[PDB]
Curated annotation (Swiss-Prot):
Effect annotated for changing D240A: Complete loss of activity
Chief location category: secreted
Protein name: Triacylglycerol lipase
Top class in the EC scheme: hydrolase
Length: 318
């Protein structure tokens, strides 16, 4: 029907990616491209595997720019609507920066705009252990990464490179080089503006995230955390391995003062443009309806949220 029939094509920009160029990427936004298409959206999913950072000369941002130009040629459209998850939001920021006239909006879904405390933690472990692996938490993350992408003769080094880009230092510098009206003050834990007229082009800036992992009590110097997406004996804890894994990574973050997170990105780091909500009982993969659609008892429907938003865009005139 036309519910999600925006004026400009929607491009879904994945974040967690492997190193193999010749990879497969349709099922990252699990069940989302089809749903959007059923509602009239013209949806394209970018594959940016084999590129690490966004701002190189031969990086993800330039790749995505390429893809945006291809989609436009294929559709006879003049602008696109970028929706990005995790690093995907950061590289959507790059294209809008670099080519204002081709972008109608930039939406962020759990993007570590001010980095990740878990990514920070990992860089410290690697000072001592180059493999990471003596930390069970890191090892948990590596297996989750692997399940979401695949072993393609490896999971290990890709998993780690994925977090490299996302450290507080790294994003600090990125933002310095790639200013957006959508970002608030460093350290304020507030957003910027909902729009931005860059190069005669106004941009609709949106974001949302999930704060399923909540801190609880400090005893003996350590502060607990709770997953608030699950119910007691939740099957999602067995059926989906990322559920507890991201509670573990999320607990590390909490003990590095992140303070409410999806287990990878904290609430404050997530904020960009018009924040639709950060109240979702989601951990980092529930956001993309992931690990094959399993969510805890209290997690909202990822697919409805994104669809409602693509309709929002239709109503805003993009
Ligand atoms: Ca899940």
């Amino acid at each position: 029907d036309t519910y999600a029939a925006t004026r400009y094509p929607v491009i879904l920009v994945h974040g967690l990616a492997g190193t193999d160029k010749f990879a497969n990427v349709v099922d990252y936004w699990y069940g989302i491209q089809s749903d959007l298409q059923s509602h009239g959206a013209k949806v394209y999913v970018a594959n940016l595997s084999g590129f690490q950072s966004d701002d190189g000369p031969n990086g993800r941002g330039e790749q995505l720019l390429a893809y945006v130009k291809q989609v436009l040629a294929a559709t006879g459209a003049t602008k696109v609507n970028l929706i990005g998850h995790s690093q995907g939001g950061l590289t959507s920021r790059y294209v809008a920066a670099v080519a204002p006239q081709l972008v109608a909006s930039v939406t962020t879904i759990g993007t570590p705009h001010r980095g990740s405390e878990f990514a920070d933690f990992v860089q410290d472990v690697l000072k001592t252990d180059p493999t990471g692996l003596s930390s069970t938490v890191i090892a948990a993350f590596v297996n989750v990464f692997g399940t979401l992408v695949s072993s393609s003769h490896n999971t290990d080094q890709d998993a780690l490179a994925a977090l490299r880009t996302l450290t507080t230092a790294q994003t600090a510098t990125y933002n310095r080089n790639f200013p957006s009206a959508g970002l608030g003050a460093p350290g304020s834990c507030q957003t910027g503006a909902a729009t931005e007229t860059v190069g005669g082009s106004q941009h609709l800036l949106y974001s949302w995230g999930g704060t399923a992992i909540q801190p609880t009590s400090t005893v003996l110097g350590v502060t607990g955390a709770t997953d608030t997406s699950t119910g007691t004996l939740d099957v999602a804890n067995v059926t989906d391995p990322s559920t507890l894994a991201l509670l573990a990574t999320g607990a590390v973050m909490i003990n590095r003062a992140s303070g409410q997170n999806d287990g990878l990105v904290s609430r404050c780091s997530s904020l960009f443009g018009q924040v639709i909500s950060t109240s979702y009982h989601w951990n980092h993969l529930d956001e993309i309806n992931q690990l094959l659609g399993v969510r805890g008892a209290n997690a909202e429907d990822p697919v409805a949220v994104i669809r409602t938003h693509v309709n929002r865009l239709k109503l805003q005139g993009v």
